[PDB]
Amino acid sequence: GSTAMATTMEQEICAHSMTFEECPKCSALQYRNGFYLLKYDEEWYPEELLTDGEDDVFDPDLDMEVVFETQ
Ligand SMILES: [Zn+2]
């Protein structure tokens, strides 16, 4: 959405300030903002990802213990 759809985009919009999963719960009478709106559980502005480096946090200085097929 090029234009501002309920102020913030990509986090979706339903009835009143919640989550995508939470949306069927509120299709309630209030309809204040957007029950899908508060959270679409999309990461916003991850500094770690933006900064060049290792793929995962656990990747640097990872010491792996090998069980040598011993159960
Ligand atoms: Zn709806």
UniProtKB/Swiss-Prot annotation:
Modified residues annotated as Phosphotyrosine in this record: 45
Ranges annotated as unnamed zinc finger: 14-26
Region (Acidic) location: 41-65
PTM notes: Phosphorylated.
Binding site for RNA: 26, 50-54
Modified residues (Phosphothreonine): 51
Function per UniProt: Forms a complex with host RAN and probably binds to exportins carrying activated MAPK in order to mediate the hyperphosphorylation of host Phe/Gly containing nuclear pore proteins (Nups) resulting in cessation of active nucleocytoplasmic transport. Proteins with NLS signals fail to import, cellular mRNAs fail to export, and some proteins small enough for diffusion are not retained anymore (efflux). The resulting inhibition of cellular protein synthesis serves to ensure maximal viral gene expression and to evade host immune response.
Subunit note: Interacts with host RAN; the complex L-RAN recruits cellular kinases responsible for the L-induced nucleocytoplasmic trafficking inhibition. The complex L-RAN can further bind to the host exportins XPO1/CRM1 and CSE1L/CAS. Interacts with the protein 2A.
Annotated protein name in UniProt: Leader protein
Naturally occurring in which organism (per UniProt): Mengo encephalomyocarditis virus
